[PDB]
Write a protein that binds this ligand. Structure first.
Ligand SMILES: CC(C)(O)CCOc1ccc2cc(O)c(N3CC(=O)NS3(=O)=O)c(F)c2c1
Ligand SMILES: [Cl-]
Ligand SMILES: [Cl-]
Ligand code: NA
Length: 299
């Protein structure tokens, strides 16, 4: 593939940092006026990570519609994602309000609550069936229904209830627990095994609202996940691996949220994941079982 040839050339010349810096230099800069309003200071986890105004998710409330969340609409791939920061103690109600209003079926969490000795995300979902969470400010209730615990990720089935109408929805929560802050997954196989677990759930399908993807800031790990998924979907459309330009796809995504993919090694890993995933897209369905084995998800 042209993607494989490009990877080989960058590796041989040792120019991942330069390629990655080129992307940062060419990336879109759009205003984030709402994110920077004084009233929204305590709704942002990081001073330097904000949603662009043009693509921010608006909460459907009159008081304050702001959440640090972006709609990434990949027009050619025909898939949308919401990328958001790890909720703060005061924005967990907003987070589930967004999930409800945007009709999302899945939440993909790529971080842990504590990383490198600091708190990176609130405990925004219940870990025990009998201890449900009630978000009084947004009139929502959230109950853990079941979970499937694997070695490096956990899938949870949640029930989200609109307390105003008593309507309920199933939310699937995919928690990747071994992807370090500013780091990469253990292998392409472990990443792809997890990505296709998300896909198989239906959470990425167009009948539902956009999947909500987050890490701590919602850009490094979240960007890597969504770049790989979109590239594999583009390749699927006409079964043509050489028709995917990873750097171009990443620049397109960065029109919708700043800073997606935060290290040169996350960019390199993205290539690895797409190159390996291409084996499945191009017709070797058996490689999915191989990824499951190589991921050691039982062990
Ligand atoms: C957009 C810009 C100009 O580059 C400024 C980026 O400023 C920041 C500030 C704090 C961060 C904290 C994170 O934990 C983080 N993560 C690393 C990962 O791999 N995933 S992440 O959770 O998104 C970030 F990327 C951050 C980026
Ligand atoms: Cl740690
Ligand atoms: Cl970490
Ligand atoms: Na190869």
């Amino acid at each position: 593939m042209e993607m494989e040839k490009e990877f080989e050339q960058i590796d041989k010349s040792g120019s991942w940092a330069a390629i990655y810096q080129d992307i940062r230099h060419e990336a879109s800069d759009f205003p984030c006026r709402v994110a920077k309003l004084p009233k929204n200071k305590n709704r942002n986890r990081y001073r330097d990570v904000s949603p662009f105004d043009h693509s921010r998710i608006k909460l459907h409330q009159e008081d304050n519609d702001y959440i640090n969340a972006s709609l990434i609409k990949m027009e050619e791939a025909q898939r949308s994602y919401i990328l958001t920061q790890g909720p703060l103690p005061n924005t967990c109600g907003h987070f589930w309000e967004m999930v409800w209003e945007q009709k999302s079926r899945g939440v993909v969490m790529l971080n842990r609550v504590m990383e490198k000795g600091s708190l990176k995300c609130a405990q925004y979902w219940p870990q025990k069936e009998e201890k449900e969470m009630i978000f009084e400010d947004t009139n929502l209730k959230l109950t853990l229904i079941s979970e499937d615990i694997k070695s490096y990720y956990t899938v949870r089935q949640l029930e989200l209830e609109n307390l105003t109408t008593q309507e309920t929805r199933e939310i699937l929560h995919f928690h990747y627990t071994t992807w370090p802050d500013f780091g990469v997954p253990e292998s392409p196989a472990s990443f792809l095994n997890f990505l296709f677990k998300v896909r198989e759930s239906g959470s990425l399908s167009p009948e539902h609202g956009p999947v909500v993807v987050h890490c701590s800031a919602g850009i490094g790990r979240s960007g890597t996940f969504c770049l790989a998924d979109t590239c594999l979907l583009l390749m699927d459309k006409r079964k043509d691996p050489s028709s995917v330009d990873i750097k171009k796809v990443l620049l397109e995504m960065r029109k919708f949220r700043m800073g997606l993919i935060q290290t040169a090694d996350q960019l390199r890993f993205s290539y690895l994941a797409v190159i390996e995933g291409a084996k499945f897209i191009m017709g070797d369905s058996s490689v999915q079982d191989q990824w499951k084995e190589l991921s050691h998800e039982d062990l």
